[PDB]
């Protein structure tokens with residue numbers, strides 16, 4: 001079933017329930033996921049109204065871009081030309097600049113396919129918005145089906161050569177309570193290398209490093225606490241994890257990550273080359289989620305995209321988008337129960 | 347009473363009915379007026395869903411900007427520097443460029459004051475959007491009261507020196523049917539001068555012309571047909587009226603214009619210096635409103651703003667907006683019914 005209601009400030013809340021009774025909800029403010037529940041438990045972080053996003057933290061569950069992550073000094077080179085983008089984090093351009101796409105009301109249409117329901121959100125980034133050449137016609141389709149798969153499909157076309165590398169900013173917390181650390185979750189991730197950050201400004205260091213057999217090696221499932229407890233320089237730099245992980249094998253067919261807590265698992269599939277993992281390293285900020293004060297490490301993202309820093313590390317990829325060329329990206333989060341035996345204590 | 351409903355594509359329709367039983371409706375799509383009706387008759391032109399506006403004509407009833415009207419060559423000078431804005435009508439920038447603020451979903455909040463209800467729409471125009479320096483945080487408040495006054499109050503703040511001169515693009519048609527010309531309405535307008543257009547591109551000619559004792563003098567109420575049957579080359583040029591008229595006396599307290607048909611009249615008040623009057627000179631286009639085929643002359647605007655063309659005729663005014671200055675503008679359309 002599909003239900004809709006005002007969510008505040010003129011945004012709407014679109015709630016879907018599949019045949020298995022799992023419910024998931026989205027808002028056109030930022031073409032964002034608001035909630036995902038199984039048996040009355042929140043599997044992700046979200047707020048109860050649009051205003052909360054605008055006043056507390058506008059990134060959770062949002063579609064972010066046109067470029068996700070940090071761009072050093074807001075500088076990109078487009079078809080031999082240098083362009084300077086809005087700089088919203090010091091000299092850095094973070095998630096497309098200030099008042100970016102995650103803050104706008106997108107228009108949308110819902111398509112009921114029966115075993116699958118699609119919510120296609122649309123928005124036009126005008127030419128020159130935040131320094132980006134355009135215009136860019138974007139669309140984000142979120143869909144949920146009877147097999148418990150939540151899929152995100154991105155599409156975009158630009159009138160001018162530009163750059164495009166958006167992502168979905170959901171935060172998982174299988175505890176269903178923001179005040180509970182995700183250190184008790186087990187994580188498996190098919191990546192042998194990561195991108196280190198230069199310093200507290202979080203721009204990339206410039207090298208790619210092998211993490212096999214370190215506390216950041218999750219090729220084989222391990223508790224997140226192993227990482228959180230680590231004193232590796234990179235962990236200490238950010239007080240948790242806030243880095244791009246380079247997938248070892250590409251392809252939408254491969255389970256690239258799996259996050260488990262007791263009998264519940266979330267599997268990640270994508271056609272993108274990397275996954276930026278940020279573990280809500282907010283310290284004592286304590287943003288309130290459903291009246292629960294969020295704890296340091298009270299959430300984790302799986303931002304699938306071309307890794308940030310390609311400006312400095314060309315090997316990471318090319319996010320340029322030629323005029324008239326159609327961009328597409330697909331990311332899938334799937335829910336499972338009793339996928340494996342995960343019985344731990346923290 | 348206030349009623350909010352889905353208007354299509356995620357847009358909302360906010361309808362306000364006052365003590366008098368008069369209903370006005372707006373949508374966040376373009377911070378726009380959709381309908382205005384009395385005793386079941388529409389006073390303005392509008393569609394029945396968000397999609398229609400996007401497919402048929404996105405201007406009707408919308409908030410247009412950041413700059414309303416045509417800018418020659420899309421060129422403006424900001425702090426001695428040339429800036430080229432998005433060009434969407436040949437080399438001109440018309441109504442802020444393509445996919446402008448009238449096509450966006452603005453956020454909004456409703457405030458019920460009892461005799462008066464306000465709907466405050468907000469939108470951020472990012473720095474560089476369509477070539478305009480920013481960011482510009484904008485808000486447009488449409489309000490309706492028990493005195494049948496529909497008011498529009500604009501506010502803006504920019505992080506950088508820029509240009510700003512929006513307008514409301516409602517089209518009136520007291521016939522209540524788009525298939526009927528407005529030639530039968532009577533118009534009164536407190537302006538003795540107008541801004542002639544250069545040619546069919548509709549850019550300004552360069553001069554200011556006295557209209558006293560011409561077919562365009564409405565200082566004294568007269569029927570539209572007059573203007574419409576005039577042989578003045580300017581009328582002939584556009585096949586109707588599509589011009590900025592310069593108001594003789596500035597100030598919000600002066601009734602600047604009045605549109606009348608039978609017992610029903612609309613009065614216009616504004617703090618702006620000019621009123622752009624466009625008479626829906628669409629020829630055979632036949633756009634459909636409520637299933638009625640629009641006729642050439644099937645509507646008329648009162649766009650209050652600084653006259654277009656100030657880029658070439660500085661006397662007209664200056665639309666610049668300095669960083670950190672607060673822009674404000676107010677326009678009111680008041681509805682009256684003679685108890686005959």
Ligand SMILES: OC[C@H]1O[C@H](O)[C@H](O)[C@@H](O)[C@H]1O
Nearest residue numbers: 059069094202242276278301
């Ligand atoms: O809160 C926004 C969040 O976005 C991503 O997760 C970044 O990597 C984090 O450093 C942080 O900036």
Ligand SMILES: OC[C@H]1O[C@H](O)[C@H](O)[C@@H](O)[C@H]1O
Nearest residue numbers: 405415548588589622624647
């Ligand atoms: O439909 C848009 C309309 O906008 C204004 O009123 C112009 O002056 C008209 O020439 C026309 O372009």
Ligand code: NA
Nearest residue numbers: 012356357358
């Ligand atoms: Na809506």
